[PDB]
Amino acid sequence: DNSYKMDYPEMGLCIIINNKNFHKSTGMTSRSGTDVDAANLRETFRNLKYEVRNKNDLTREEIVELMRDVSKEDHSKRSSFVCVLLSHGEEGIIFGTNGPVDLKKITNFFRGDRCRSLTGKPKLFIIQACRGTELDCGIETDDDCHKIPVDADFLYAYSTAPGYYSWRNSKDGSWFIQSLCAMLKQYADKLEFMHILTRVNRKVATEFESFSFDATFHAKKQIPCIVSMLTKELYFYH
Amino acid sequence: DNSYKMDYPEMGLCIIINNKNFHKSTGMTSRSGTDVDAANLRETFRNLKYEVRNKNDLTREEIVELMRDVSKEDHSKRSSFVCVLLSHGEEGIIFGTNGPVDLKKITNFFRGDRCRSLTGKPKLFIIQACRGTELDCGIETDDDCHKIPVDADFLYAYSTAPGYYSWRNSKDGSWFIQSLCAMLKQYADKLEFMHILTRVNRKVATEFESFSFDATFHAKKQIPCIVSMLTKELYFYH
Ligand SMILES: *CC(=O)[C@H](CC(=O)O)NS(=O)(=O)c1cccc(CSSCCNC(=O)c2ccc(S(C)(=O)=O)s2)c1
Numbered sequence: 001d002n003s004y005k006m007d008y009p010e011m012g013l014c015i016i017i018n019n020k021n022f023h024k025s026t027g028m029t030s031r032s033g034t035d036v037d038a039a040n041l042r043e044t045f046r047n048l049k050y051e052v053r054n055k056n057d058l059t060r061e062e063i064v065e066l067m068r069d070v071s072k073e074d075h076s077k078r079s080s081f082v083c084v085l086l087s088h089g090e091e092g093i094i095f096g097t098n099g100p101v102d103l104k105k106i107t108n109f110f111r112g113d114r115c116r117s118l119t120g121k122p123k124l125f126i127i128q129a130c131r132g133t134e135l136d137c138g139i140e141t142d143d144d145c146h147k148i149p150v151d152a153d154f155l156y157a158y159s160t161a162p163g164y165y166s167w168r169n170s171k172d173g174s175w176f177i178q179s180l181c182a183m184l185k186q187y188a189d190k191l192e193f194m195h196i197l198t199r200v201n202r203k204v205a206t207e208f209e210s211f212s213f214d215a216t217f218h219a220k221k222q223i224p225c226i227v228s229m230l231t232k233e234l235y236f237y238h
Numbered sequence: 239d240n241s242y243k244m245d246y247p248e249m250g251l252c253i254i255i256n257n258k259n260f261h262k263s264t265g266m267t268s269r270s271g272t273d274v275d276a277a278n279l280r281e282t283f284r285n286l287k288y289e290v291r292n293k294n295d296l297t298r299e300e301i302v303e304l305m306r307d308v309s310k311e312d313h314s315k316r317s318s319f320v321c322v323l324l325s326h327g328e329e330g331i332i333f334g335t336n337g338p339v340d341l342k343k344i345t346n347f348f349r350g351d352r353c354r355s356l357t358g359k360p361k362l363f364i365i366q367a368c369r370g371t372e373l374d375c376g377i378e379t380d381d382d383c384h385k386i387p388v389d390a391d392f393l394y395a396y397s398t399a400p401g402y403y404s405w406r407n408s409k410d411g412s413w414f415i416q417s418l419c420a421m422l423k424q425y426a427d428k429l430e431f432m433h434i435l436t437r438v439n440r441k442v443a444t445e446f447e448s449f450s451f452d453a454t455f456h457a458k459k460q461i462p463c464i465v466s467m468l469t470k471e472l473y474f475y476h
Pocket residue numbers: 031087088089090128129130131165166167168169170174209210211212217
């Protein structure tokens with residue numbers, strides 16, 4: 001039992017929150033290209049056998065509400081849980097159309113003590129959003145009851161390092177989401193999740209570089225950030 | 239080339255900063271047991287063929303200094319770099335004997351742009367320290383400049399989740415370090431680093447629970463936190 005039981009009747013839900021248009025009141029640009037991201041995740045997770053539910057342009061409130069309701073579902077027959085957040089953001093924050101939401105609030109609904117039908121099951125959060133304004137210019141090449149931690153079995157696949165900008169191309173989508181999808185399509189049938197995510201790290205880090213008319217944003221790099229509290233290996237098959 | 243080149247003439251340095259006694263002026267307890275931690279890491283890393291250098295009770299200044307100097311070495315002939323910080327801490331902070339140091343300051347010396355002999359080489363930071371005061375009560379069971387990001391090829395193996403306390407036993411050491419060492423001893427010859435670190439996560443999360451005379455700190459759990467910006471697989475052999 002080094003790997004998670006992934007032979008339940010259902011793989012699980014894959015909730016995609018796709019925020020494209022924001023309230024002018026926030027002073028935030030449209031996320032051109034995010035639809036391509038959404039469509040790619042949908043098809044990719046569909047082939048993995050996940051029940052996909054897309055949600056477009058949700059308010060901070062709608063996001064909290066969506067997450068609460070989903071955490072209140074009976075996941076007993078589901079192997080895992082995937083949530084993908086596509087939006088603007090800051091460190092520890094994701095933006096609804098009308099304002100920011102703490103990631104901690106979203107993930108808390110899924111704590112091992114608050115979502116009992118998911119206790120002991122992998123809970124994946126995939127987040128394409130900025131975590132700050134830093135830019136990366138790159139470099140040329142005894143005692144033994146039987147409790148488990150409530151923050152355990154979480155995996156947070158971040159599109160970028162803490163404090164840094166996250167890059168999104170207007171026609172093809174975010175660097176991170178395109179690479180994740182591609183790596184999943186190529187390797188989900190043979191590789192452990194962590195290893196697949198390392199391939200993504202590499203692809204994003206080597207194959208992408210920003211091009212901008214504005215010197216300040218031109219020739220920048222990006223590295224994704226895998227944050228794992230998983231206690232087992234994850235394979236998308238059996 | 240899915241895995242890091244680990245056949246250089248030397249595996250690399252393994253710096254262990256072991257802070258046990260702090261200045262009264264800080265109002266911080268001695269870290270009873272940390273010596274067991276230090277001794278175990280030394281032995282474990284020695285078997286892995288790492289050049290181990292232990293440093294006891296360093297000041298915030300002495301730490302900055304140690305790191306500067308080590309980043310200024312010629313690591314051309316080294317496959318990797320390991321740094322282990324054993325001390326009190328807070329989110330993003332590690333304490334010297336006389337005060338706190340920002341982790342970012344420590345790791346920045348090793349950025350791909352500031353330590354050219356480690357560019358493209360895995361830089362591991364293993365950290366036994368608190369990240370806050372939260373407690374875990376648990377639950378019963380086109381376009382192609384060939385740059386890479388400067389923040390890439392880093393791995394931060396945190397003893398605990400963000401915001402949380404990290405547990406250390408007076409006679410046997412920290413829960414995290416004892417488990418890391420054991421897992422390295424058992425699996426370093428066959429398993430990829432990430433997978434080993436996942437075993438650690440499991441061991442800590444299942445086999446450990448606090449026991450305290452004070453209800454506030456009794457029966458608590460802990461989950462470690464793997465943070466990976468690696469672009470390749472890491473094996474401690476070849
Ligand atoms: C910052 C965010 O929250 C947002 C995340 C998201 O997916 O929307 N990041 S962003 O893509 O909007 C972003 C990226 C870099 C800088 C900024 C500040 S506004 S400056 C806009 C620069 N223009 C570009 O986005 C690009 C230039 C070249 C690009 S390419 C073809 O190399 O991908 S993209 C906001």
